[PDB]
Amino acid sequence: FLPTALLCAYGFFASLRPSEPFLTPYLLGPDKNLTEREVFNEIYPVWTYSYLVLLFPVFLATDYLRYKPVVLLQGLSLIVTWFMLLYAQGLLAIQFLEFFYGIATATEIAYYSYIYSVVDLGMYQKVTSYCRSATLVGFTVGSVLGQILVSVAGWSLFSLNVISLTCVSVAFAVAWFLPMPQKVLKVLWNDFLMCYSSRPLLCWSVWWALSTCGYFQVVNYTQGLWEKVMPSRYAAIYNGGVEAVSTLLGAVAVFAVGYIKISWSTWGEMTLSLFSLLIAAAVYIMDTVGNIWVCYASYVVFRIIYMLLITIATFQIAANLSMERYALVFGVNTFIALALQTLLTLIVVDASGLGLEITTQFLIYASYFALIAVVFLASGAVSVMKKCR
């Protein structure tokens, strides 16, 4: 019990990052004095590229080292990331800054998969439910703490990211004392291939991956959009409260998805298409309001619909999937999804390619969110063609 309590405490401390909601005013202010165009155009794409190229090696090293040193890697990466975030000037230094954050984020899969390597299989589901609940409540607590310390307390971000670094150091020091984790050419190629040679095997997969693409593309630059529609020089940004309420409602909706007994085979495609249409409407609205409270509201609704869609996707996949296939499928689909966001980054995001302005990148994205609905409807249309007969 005590190792598991240490696990949940370490996860709570590592996820407790008060500085996550308030990242954007730190860079724009006298703290770094960086051109935000250059930041948006160059700093972030190499993070995505490094995460793509580095996910596979560390994911295989987890099995190579039997999940033991990966938490140490995550802790050291947090330490070096926060040191570099406190000390970095120019362009290449901040490129390394974000490379460190990428190699840190690449080990969240290792964290969430190590839990299976030490506890009983029957108890694994309940303990990982407790772990994700701890992560969610730590996210909410950190967000509200940052909001209180920034607005209610009127404390500057300097002490806030100092205590963020202190918290990640405490997390590493706690995680150092874990117990022992006692636990491919054609076979592994067929291992993921068999997860697509059936009617429901291939289905929902690319849909989940492209929804993941939409979120991982919009969440990073939502901060920039909020800052550009309302400068922080003469305004205060309420990121902590919106993040807290969004995550709380997402968790509530995830819990409530299984609380209604509805068969998937009746109208699963219709619900998926409706969810995609709502997501496209939300992103087009947040593109086309030019205000502050309404754009937060649209963001909240978009987050909620995102959680509903991915949650029902996870139920469908897990019903289709097997007990030992979770890690492999979550690896392969994540890999192809990351290849896809990286590709689209080559088209639009980077300054070497087209480099379209962040403001004007959300126009077509409704049709991008609708194109996945069109092919779902195109698959639905054949299904509708075959439904009556």
- C-beta of 47 vs 275, nearer to ligand UEG: 47
Name the minimum Å distance from CB 222 to ligand UEG: 9
- C-beta of 20 vs 191, nearer to ligand UEG: 20
Name the minimum Å distance from CB 273 to ligand UEG: 31
- C-beta of 21 vs 380, nearer to ligand UEG: 21
Residues just before a chain gap in the chain (C–N exceeding 2.5 Å) are 183
- C-beta of 14 vs 332, nearer to ligand UEG: 14
Name the minimum Å distance from CB 240 to ligand UEG: 12
Whole-angstrom distance between the N-terminal and C-terminal Cα of the chain? 56
Name the minimum Å distance from CB 20 to ligand UEG: 4
Contact 161, 87 (CB under 8 A): no
Query: How many angstroms separate the CA atoms of 73 and 79, rounded?
Result: 10
Name the minimum Å distance from CB 59 to ligand UEG: 20
Alpha carbon 78 to chain centroid distance? 17
Name the minimum Å distance from CB 24 to ligand UEG: 8
Name the minimum Å distance from CB 97 to ligand UEG: 9
Q: Which two tokens stand for residue 266?
A: 């009746």
- C-beta of 351 vs 384, nearer to ligand UEG: 351
Burial of 326 (0-12, 13-18, 19+ CB in 10 A): middle
Query: How many angstroms separate the CA atoms of 113 and 185, rounded?
Result: 23
Name the minimum Å distance from CB 180 to ligand UEG: 31
Query: How many angstroms separate the CA atoms of 128 and 112, rounded?
Result: 8
- C-beta of 44 vs 275, nearer to ligand UEG: 44
Name the minimum Å distance from CB 224 to ligand UEG: 10
Distances (CA, A) of 389 to 23, 239, 266, 386: 56, 52, 15, 5
The b/e string for 140-165 (b: 16+ C-beta within 10 A; e otherwise) is bebbbbbbebbeeeeeebeebbebbb
Query: How many angstroms separate the CA atoms of 365 and 358, rounded?
Result: 12
For 284, residues 6+ apart whose C-beta sits below 8 A from its C-beta are 362, 363, 365, 366
- C-beta of 59 vs 99, nearer to ligand UEG: 99
Give the interface with ligand UEG as residue ranges (CB under 6 A). Answer: 20, 23, 44, 101, 220, 223
The sign of the dihedral angle between the CA atoms of 135, 328, 52, 87 is: positive
Name the minimum Å distance from CB 28 to ligand UEG: 13
**Residue with the closest Cβ to ligand UEG?**
20
- C-beta of 19 vs 316, nearer to ligand UEG: 19
- C-beta of 157 vs 377, nearer to ligand UEG: 157
- C-beta of 13 vs 101, nearer to ligand UEG: 101
